[PDB]
Amino acid sequence: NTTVLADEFIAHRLGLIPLQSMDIEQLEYSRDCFCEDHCDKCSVVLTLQAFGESESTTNVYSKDLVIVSNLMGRNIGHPIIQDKEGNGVLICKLRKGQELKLTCVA
Amino acid sequence: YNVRMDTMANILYYPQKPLGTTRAMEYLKFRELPAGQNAIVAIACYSGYNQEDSMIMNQSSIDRGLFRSLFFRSYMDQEKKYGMSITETFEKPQRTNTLRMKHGTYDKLDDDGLIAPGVRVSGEDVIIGKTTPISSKRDASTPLRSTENGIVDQVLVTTNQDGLKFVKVRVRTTKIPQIGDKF
Amino acid sequence: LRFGEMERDCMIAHGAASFLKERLMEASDAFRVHICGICGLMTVIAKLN
Amino acid sequence: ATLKYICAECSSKLSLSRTDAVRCKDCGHRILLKARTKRLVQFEAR
Amino acid sequence: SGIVPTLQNIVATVTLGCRLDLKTVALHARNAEYNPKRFAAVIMRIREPKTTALIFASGKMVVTGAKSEDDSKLASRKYARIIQKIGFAAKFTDFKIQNIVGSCDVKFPIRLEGLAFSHGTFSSYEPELFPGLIYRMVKPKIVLLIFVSGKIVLTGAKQREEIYQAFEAIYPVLSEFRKM
Amino acid sequence: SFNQFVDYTLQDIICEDSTLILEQLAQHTTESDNISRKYEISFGKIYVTKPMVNESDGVTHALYPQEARLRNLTYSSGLFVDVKKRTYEAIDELKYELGKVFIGRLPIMLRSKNCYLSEATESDLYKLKECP
Amino acid sequence: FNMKLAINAKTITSGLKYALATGNWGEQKKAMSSRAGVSQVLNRYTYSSTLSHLRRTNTPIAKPRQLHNTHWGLVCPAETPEGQACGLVKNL
Amino acid sequence: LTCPECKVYPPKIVERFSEGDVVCALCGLVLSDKLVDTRSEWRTFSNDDHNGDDPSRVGEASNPLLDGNNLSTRIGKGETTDMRFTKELNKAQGKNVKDNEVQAAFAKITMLCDAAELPKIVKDCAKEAYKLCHDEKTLKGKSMESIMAASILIGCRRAEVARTFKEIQSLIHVKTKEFGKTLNIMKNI
Amino acid sequence: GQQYSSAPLRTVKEVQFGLFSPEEVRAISVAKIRFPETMDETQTRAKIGGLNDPRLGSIDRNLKCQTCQEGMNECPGHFGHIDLAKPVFHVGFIAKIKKVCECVCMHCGK
Amino acid sequence: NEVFSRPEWMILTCLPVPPPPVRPSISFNESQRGEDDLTFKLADILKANISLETLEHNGAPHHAIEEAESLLQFHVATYMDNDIAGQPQALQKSGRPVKSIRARLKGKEGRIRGNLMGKRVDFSARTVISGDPNLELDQVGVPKSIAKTLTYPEVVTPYNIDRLTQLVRNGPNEHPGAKYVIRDSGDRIDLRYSKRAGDIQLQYGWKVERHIMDNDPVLFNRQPSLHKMSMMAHRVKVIPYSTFRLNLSVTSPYNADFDGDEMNLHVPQSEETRAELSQL
Ligand SMILES: [Mg+2]
Ligand SMILES: [Zn+2]
Ligand SMILES: [Zn+2]
Ligand SMILES: [Zn+2]
Ligand SMILES: [Zn+2]
Ligand SMILES: [Zn+2]
User: Fold this and answer.
1) Which runs of consecutive H residues, i.e. helices, occur in F5-63?
2) Are J226 and J270 in the same domain?
3) What are the structural domains, with CATH classification, of chain A?
4) DSSP per residue, I16-79
5) Other C-beta atoms within 10 Å of B12: how many?
6) What number of C-beta contacts closer than 8 Å exist between H and J?
7) Residue D6: left (phi > 0), alpha (psi -120 to 50), or beta?
8) Counting ligands in written order, which one lies closest to the CA of residue C36?
9) Chains near C (3 or more Cβ pairs under 8 Å)
10) Chain B nearest CA to J183, separation (Å)
């Protein structure tokens, strides 16, 4: 995180980003799940890598989130995009060498 | 704020310009750099938990980021020179040859005697390892305040006007609204 | 914390003789000396052992 | 590939140790931050 | 070592046993200079053996420049003989060598600062003051002046043997710090 | 206020008492007596540099407000005064005649004339890691 | 008469550094009566807090605490502390 | 300290400062209960109190390495003071006062470092080099303004502050060969 | 804790104020106090038989408290005396002394 | 009085020298050492003494002696009192005047007003107060953390033995737990570190220093305290969140509100003390 924002400031926002919870009913609460922390049966893994290549301000959107976990073919974890331009929630703004590399467990 | 090392810094997460403003604020830079947020306020008698100057907060709103703030404290330490021979040192003290160690843990220290920025800390833990050799050597280390905790934000190493090695450590926490919190 | 003068007063008002003694002794300061019976001084070389 | 400190302005992985003073290659600006730690830090999502 | 230091200078004292009028000596002896305003003695030199004597009013003198014990005694005798020939009841008494200086050349260069750091208690080296390293040997008690060139100066000896023993003792350490 | 003190007040403080003299009048016995002298020391124009810093390794260089706050230095500039030393003498009533010196470091007030940040544009301050 | 030996720079340098630092407006590490609190650390809690600190007035020692008519347009009628310093700390 | 119950050679003990106890980390036996804050206790000796209002401020710090142990206050003006008694009690300190005055040669070193732009660590080495060699028989009768000019290069040569001998020849004074021999007889000590 | 003493535990019933007779001050004292030196047996790390513990109280987590021993958390600390060259006024009683002279004969003491 | 106070004893001839406890020293780092102002003032008395002794012994120059006497007079005098009217204060290098003995006893914050007539205490706790319509008049909401710190020393007895053993087992971190075990022997067992904190087998007469628990009597106080009602005994109620909760009707006696007021809590340590609180 080379951003003007705090690790946890960003972290907080990521929770408020709406995710597809259609098939939420076929996912287990990790508390009830039998693994060690999380797994596929109980979580969705999201990834976010962003960098200021542009001289202009580089924006980070809920669209920039990528699912890395196996979905078991169920309608889940897709960042909800209601946005006309199709960007979703604006998470961050980066300048030049501003990099943001993180991992989310939903 | 992000480029300065001050003892204590309090920054509001999502500041808001006021809905009700003064023509004089234009010159005061207030709408550019605000001191609060426009809250949805009911003047009501509810559960009686707002009696005698107390107030009720929407715990739902608090989760959404209402009134959260950043908090940065900065710890400093010098490597002092006591005359011709005695010199303090930046290092990770070993409990066998170091007296009066802090009960806190020293594991988060790299061999230069500092925690790398990014490590999460907690009460009584050792941010800066220091010894004041006298003879083998006593422990002169800096622990994080016992009533606080957080994640190390930045750590800088420098020399001063006469060239004494000294190190500044910033610690960031996020203070969510709680009960005895004044507004 | 400081159990100060004004707090001593409230305890004296309540008649909490033993509660006060405790605050001032057991809960703080309290110490034991050996004094002389002739000149009531703390002179005594107590080699209590 | 590994590092230590940084130019507070020309941000250029520097690094050093004892008695090597505390300067930079060209611009002296004896400030120098210390860059992050490899070990990932974890956070609460709320 | 295979090298033998060369005696370069020997200082000896001689009591002629009889007061002297330095002003008169300076007047009747050739190659004599007397300037009481700076030194209360007559400085006289001879060619064989090439030496220089310091003659005092007390009748005592110092003979310098001799390169062997024999030349020193011999030169001393000539000076006394001149004092007599001038008109004094001078006699050749208490002859005694007080200092012998010798020099060498080990032929190789020497890293002096390494030698100084190694033998700190005996050597003082600070090129700023003097280019050579001053080694104060304990046994024998001889002072050496060690140079980067391999040139060695040994002084403080009363017997020529001490110069020789001093050189043998220092050769190993000289060799150890040879620049090669 | 500060500017008035630097541009004017400072000079007048150097010039009120300013010059100091010491007189050595003899015993008038005979040579080497009978020699009366008076020596002067005068203070002229006062100079004041932009803020600087004297590091441990001799080198002096400019110092910006941010470096001061981080390395805990003082944001001060140099005070320099023209000094002159005259000499006079008489025998046993007639006085006959026979540079720029550093004096101290004066702390500068930010945004004043002498501060670097005074003639600074918005984009300028940002590069200097200061808040406009 | 060697110049460097004559003028002691440290006199004025550290003499000002002392005052500004500590706040005892006087000479020097032997200060009393000296007026403490003349120089103080700038409040950086909020931007307004910083602004109002650079417009603060101290009055040391007839009825000074009261808001005088002559204070109109020159000093704030509301910005004053409660307790001990009330009406002795004026704000422009 | 070592736990009376256990006794293992590396005596693993913790200072639970917060509960004011000294515990044995193994058996948990408390080995001491009276425990004092050294930071705040040191605040009573070296404080920020120059006015004189602090009731906590009750002592003063000294430097046993440099000035030995010379405890001595100074008669000075107070709030209610006549300027007469100050003079008398000070004129009375004059009859009680040589080597207790050669400490003003520290004022010669301090005024030389500040004229040479030298750090606070160099002065204290030059003052310790001068205190341990000014009364030596090995220095005997060297130029007294060239033995303190040599102890400044001795203090600089340990504090890593680059100062050539010709840089100190410019300050005072130095006679080159005179403060060069003196810079060696001290170097042996 | 603080160790057991066979001495009878009693309560203070009366406090008898008075002044110190020099005879008594001398009699209580456990040390002479001769030197203005703290400790430092000339650049050392022990107390000087002169000021603090010439033969006095104990400090620095060390028992040595003249036979008494005990150390810090038991020792009350015992007094030393200093023998003054000439009499001096006790500042508090400079006036009661004055008044007493004012009442009595400065020759016969009547 | 011929026994305790003859007038001859007013003048000082011999000087009682107080022991280190009265004038502590501190040895920092071999080049830093702190002595008490009294130790300074004494050394001056001594130096002035040693001086005048040498003068009398030697050729007494009359006026050079009385000159040295009124110096001694000053140092001795200024040591007991430095705030003397007319006289110059003895100052200590830094410009600050020497803390005389008088001045340590004198003010509020003196030894009398501030170490004897009022003193800070252990088994005390303080935090922000807030109101509660669900607390009973006589109770006080105590934050879990505060309850987990404050302790009551309970004697092991047939009646409590089993319960106490459980809180001991619970330990210092769990909410109804304990911090220390006090054996007959006098030595304190720290449950936080003792290797035997698990297998700790209690004995009648031992003391278990256990956490403050629901319904313990505690002294609650809001300063100033110009009332006997400004300090009242409440029933503990361990609760979450960092504030002391009080019933609203009890607001008036304390003179409290919840605009940022803090309140003091004192814990009795004896069955006797507790009775005093609950019964009076
Ligand atoms: Mg209130
Ligand atoms: Zn799972
Ligand atoms: Zn008795
Ligand atoms: Zn750089
Ligand atoms: Zn004792
Ligand atoms: Zn009579």
Assistant:
1) 10-15
2) yes
3) 1-106 (2.170.120.12)
4) ------HHHHHHH-S-----S--S-SSSSSS--SSSSSSS----SS---STTT---SSS-----
5) 15
6) 170
7) beta
8) 3
9) I, J
10) 25
- The domains found in chain E, sorted by start residue, are 1-11+98-180 (3.30.310.10), 12-97 (3.30.310.10)
Report whether J81 belongs to an annotated binding site.
no
Q: Which site among B14, B61, B70 would you substitute to test the A interface, given the most A Cβ atoms closer than 10 Å to its Cβ?
A: B70
φ/ψ bin of C24: left (φ > 0), alpha (ψ from -120 to 50), beta (otherwise): alpha
Q: Chain G: nearest CA to B33, how far in angstroms?
A: 7
CA J10 to ligand 6 center in whole angstroms = 21
What are the tokens at H3? 């736990």
HSE of E24 in the Cβ direction (CA atoms, 13 Å)? 12
Label the pairing between strands B151-159 and B165-175.
antiparallel
- On whether the CB atoms of residues I57 and I77 are closer than 8 A, the answer is yes
Phi, psi (degrees; rounded to nearest 5) at A101: -130, 115
Adjacency order of strands within the sheet including B69-78: B9-12, B69-78, B165-175, B151-159
Indicate whether J158 and J263 sit together in one domain: no
Residues in chain I closer than 8 A to C34 (CB atoms):
5, 7
Residues lining ion ligand 6 (Cβ < 5 A) are I 105, 107-108
C17-24 and J271-279 are packed helices; what angle lies between their axes, rounded to 10 degrees?
130
CB contact under 8 A, B53 and J258: yes
Measured in angstroms, the resolution is 15.3
**Number of residues in chain J:** 280
Q: State whether G48 and B10 contact (CB < 8 Å).
A: no
C-alpha distances (whole Å) from G64 to each of B121, E60, G82 are: 51, 99, 14
Task: Show the domain range for J218.
Answer: 123-149+213-280
Shortest CA distance to J113 belongs to which of H52, C13, C4? C4
Q: With touching defined as 3+ CB pairs under 8 A, do chains G and F touch?
A: yes
The experimental method, as deposited, was: cryo-EM
Check whether domain I4-87 has CATH 3.40.190.10, yes or no = no
Contact flag B96-H65 (C-beta cutoff 8 Å): no
**Shared-domain flag, residues J160 and J273:** no
Q: Are B174 and B70 within 8 A, CB to CB?
A: yes
Distance, in Å, from the CA atom of I37 to the CA atom of I48, rounded to the nearest integer, reads 7
Which residue, among J146, J150, J223, J225, would best test binding to C if mutated, counting the most C CBs under 10 Å from its CB?
J225
CA distance F57 to chain H (A): 7
What sign does the CA torsion over E25, E28, E29, E31 have?
positive
Q: What's the gap in Å between I58 CA and the centre of ligand 5? A: 7
Distance CA J79, CA J90 (A): 9
J window 61-90, beta carbon within 8 A of I: 69, 72-73, 76-78, 80-81, 84
Q: What is the CATH number of the domain that holds J232?
A: 2.40.40.20
How far apart, in whole angstroms, are the C-alpha atoms of residue B22 and residue H168? 65
* Residue H180 contacts E where some CB pair is shorter than 8 Å: yes
Range B1-14+69-176 has CATH code 2.40.280.10: no
| Burial (CB count <10 Å: 0-12, 13-18, 19+), residue E125 | buried
With CA atoms as reference, report the closest residue to I70 among H68, C44, G44, F116.
Answer: C44
- D4-46, CATH topology level: Rubrerythrin, domain 2 (2.20.28)
Phi, psi of G68 (to 5 degrees): -85, 155
- H152: how many CB neighbours lie within 10 A of its CB? 29
Give distance in angstroms: CA of C35 to centre of ligand 3: 7
Query: Long-range contacts made by residues I62-70, C-beta under 8 angstroms, separation at least 24?
Result: I66/I30, I67/C45, I67/C47, I68/C45, I68/C46, I68/C47, I69/C47, I69/C49, I70/C48
Cβ contacts (< 8 Å) between H114 and chain G: which residues? 8-10
Instruction: Choose among J31, J82, J190: nearest Cβ to H28.
Output: J190
